[PDB]
């Protein structure tokens, strides 16, 4: 019938793509990088231990200026604190206590939360009245929100459990472009510094790079064997790292369109929950289910240190824009700043 | 000014901490329950009998104890990811229609997945076998036989520790306790005293399900205190 030979052509296209991608293979990152002096064991200590959350922490996000931090907790709070003096500059109660992501605007005046209610709530942190209040209740998605990022003060990118990513105009609230193509539900998204491209990680072991203006998917990356729980762009914008339940974290580049290295050890076993690069890109920091985070050498694929010190599992991980600190949130209701 | 604003930051911090303590007291008092079941399981009937977008939230209180009950309906059937949020609830209220022999295997599989999950492995399950009147009627009917679907029913007898109704009729009792033991075999396969299931027999007419939930939550918290206020 039509379906049989159409799937035959699809498999043929897969064969052609795989052959072309293998033609790009000349040498692995190891074969070029093997003659670089190793970074060496680096030590990072818990400079600050922010506390005040009554339940597990699900997501954190830094700001444009690497001072203010927002944390999302399932007890129903989106409280934000000043990391320098360990002071809570605001506390936001939520209509729905189940929140799985939080976003700090790149202008330090809006914050967004969203969880199982399928509604992205935007709060006005810099209101004239001085009292935080929900600004626009972004509704229309048919699934739990997994990650939201502020493209601008007026545009936001949200990824939900209904296998869709969206671009919302906050002024009106209606969707602008709907990103479809994932078979599974998307868990994490990461905007590029160029703010014209972004990659998404769903539970179908596939990484899809979208373009915000066109609304299509440019390239598709498939190297994992399990659900993707974290994704992050390399600082230059031509690579991105991906975490998964398969106890590995891989790095794909965009131009060659294939994976570069896999960062994993035999005893890792547990999955990866959050991943983020340093500003230079030499160090890849990945959260883990076994109550700790590991510091990976992005080019040597060797462990350089562990940020152990968390009681429960590590849920979120964020490196500041200046790169002077790294913050990890955990399910023990404690957020720690490492430096 | 810097000193003036630095002291200003402290006062806002203190005000937040005063509110946080006032909210921490309410959070620990209130108990959270997750309601799981299929479309025909019968969650609506019980949720109406204790009550009087996306997640449906129902609040009931008994013996001056506040209970928060969540029902997740807006999500898709895929639940391997959003079920991880409820790793801290007091208990998981599982509702199973015992009168449908075709969805029983799916209910057992869901119970097995919930029980052996790494994140919910410490959450006790208050099992609610609902709509027992339909089971009794269909057992006296004889049109549908459990032998067709569950082939271990033939070599099985009601346990001594049973509480049959005066009008239960032994076949209904045997069938009910077969379903309950089918679930309990999964329950006892893995898990220490941290994990436990509390099967209950309920129907659409039952109006005391809230009190049963209260008693089982009392037992769960009692076991937790046995562990933490070291006595165990």
């Amino acid at each position: 019938s039509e379906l049989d030979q159409l799937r035959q052509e699809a498999e043929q296209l897969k064969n052609q793509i795989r052959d072309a991608r293998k033609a790009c293979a000349d040498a692995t990152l190891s074969q070029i990088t093997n003659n670089i002096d190793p970074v060496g064991r680096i030590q990072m200590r818990t400079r600050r231990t922010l506390r005040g959350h009554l339940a597990k922490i699900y997501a954190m996000h830094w700001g444009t200026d690497s001072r203010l931090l927002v944390s999302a907790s399932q007890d129903g709070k989106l409280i934000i604190w000043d990391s320098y003096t360990t002071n809570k500059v605001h506390a936001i109660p939520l209509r729905s206590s189940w929140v799985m992501t939080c976003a700090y605007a790149p202008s330090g005046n809006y914050v967004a939360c969203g969880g199982l209610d399928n509604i992205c709530s935007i709060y006005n942190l810099k209101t004239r009245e001085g009292n935080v209040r929900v600004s626009r209740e972004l509704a229309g998605h048919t699934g739990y929100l997994s990650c939201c990022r502020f493209l601008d003060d007026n545009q936001i990118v949200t990824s939900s459990g209904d296998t869709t990513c969206a671009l919302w105009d906050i002024e009106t609230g209606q969707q602008t472009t709907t990103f479809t193509g994932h078979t599974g539900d998307v868990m994490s998204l990461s905007l590029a510094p160029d703010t014209r491209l972004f990659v998404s990680g769903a539970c179908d072991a596939s990484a899809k790079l979208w373009d915000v203006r066109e609304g299509m998917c440019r390239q598709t990356f498939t190297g994992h064997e399990s659900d993707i729980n974290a994704i992050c762009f390399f600082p230059n914008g031509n690579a991105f790292a991906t975490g998964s339940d398969d106890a590995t974290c891989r790095l794909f580049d965009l131009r060659a369109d294939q994976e570069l290295m896999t960062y994993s050890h035999d005893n890792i076993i547990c999955g990866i929950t959050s991943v983020s690069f340093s500003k230079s890109g030499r160090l890849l920091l990945a959260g883990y289910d076994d109550f700790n985070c590991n510091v990976w050498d992005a080019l040597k694929a060797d462990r350089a240190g562990v940020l152990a010190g968390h009681d429960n599992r590590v849920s979120c991980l964020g490196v500041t824009d200046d790169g002077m600190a790294v913050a990890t949130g955990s399910w023990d209701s404690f957020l720690k700043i490492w430096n | 000014d810097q000193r003036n604003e630095e002291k200003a930051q402290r006062e806002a911090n203190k005000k937040i901490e005063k509110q946080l303590q006032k909210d921490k007291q309410v959070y620990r008092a209130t108990h959270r329950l997750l309601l799981l079941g299929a479309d025909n399981s019968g969650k609506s009937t019980i949720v109406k009998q204790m009550r009087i977008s996306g997640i449906f939230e129902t609040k009931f209180q008994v013996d001056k104890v506040n209970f928060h009950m969540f029902d997740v309906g807006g999500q898709r059937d895929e639940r391997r990811k959003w079920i991880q949020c409820f790793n801290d609830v007091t208990a998981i209220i599982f509702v199973v229609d015992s009168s449908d022999y075709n969805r029983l295997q799916e209910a057992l599989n869901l119970f097995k997945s919930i029980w052996n999950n790494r994140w919910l492995r410490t959450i006790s399950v208050i099992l609610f076998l609902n709509k027992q009147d339909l089971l009794a009627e269909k057992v006296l009917a004889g049109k549908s036989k459990i032998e067709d679907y569950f082939p271990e029913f033939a070599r099985y007898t009601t346990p001594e520790d049973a509480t049959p109704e005066p009008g239960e009729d032994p076949r209904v009792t045997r069938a009910k306790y077969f379903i309950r033991d089918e679930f309990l075999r999964i329950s006892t396969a893995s898990g220490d005293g941290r994990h436990y299931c509390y099967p209950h027999f309920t129907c659409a007419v039952d109006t005391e399900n809230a009190r049963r939930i209260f008693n089982d939550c009392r037992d769960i918290i009692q076991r937790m205190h046995l562990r933490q206020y070291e006595l165990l």
Partner: nanobody
Amino acid sequence: QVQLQESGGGLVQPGGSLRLSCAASGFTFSNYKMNWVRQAPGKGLEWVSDISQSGASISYTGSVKGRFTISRDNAKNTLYLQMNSLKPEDTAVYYCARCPAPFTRDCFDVTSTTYAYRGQGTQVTVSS
């Protein structure tokens, strides 16, 4: 990329035997517990059997106990399920679904309407 290619589906007389294979190329095999999922015409997806790693802790659904058997060879990344003494009520399409995560004893959404790690599957028909 993860791929699960099924095989063996065909027309068989009621009471015969046919063997269902499942090629599993795209991931490490021995660290995943796989299932079998069927879907009859005019019905939803339903469980058939499940096998853990190393060929232990085997389970079947109640309708096909004894008649069905499941086995895996990690040396070949394959899953088999042998159907013997078929009945007209076994007409369905069989899927070689896999557990979402490795080193895990709980399988979730293996019978969901849209699953990432499940093959297109072969149609098994029984008629006189």
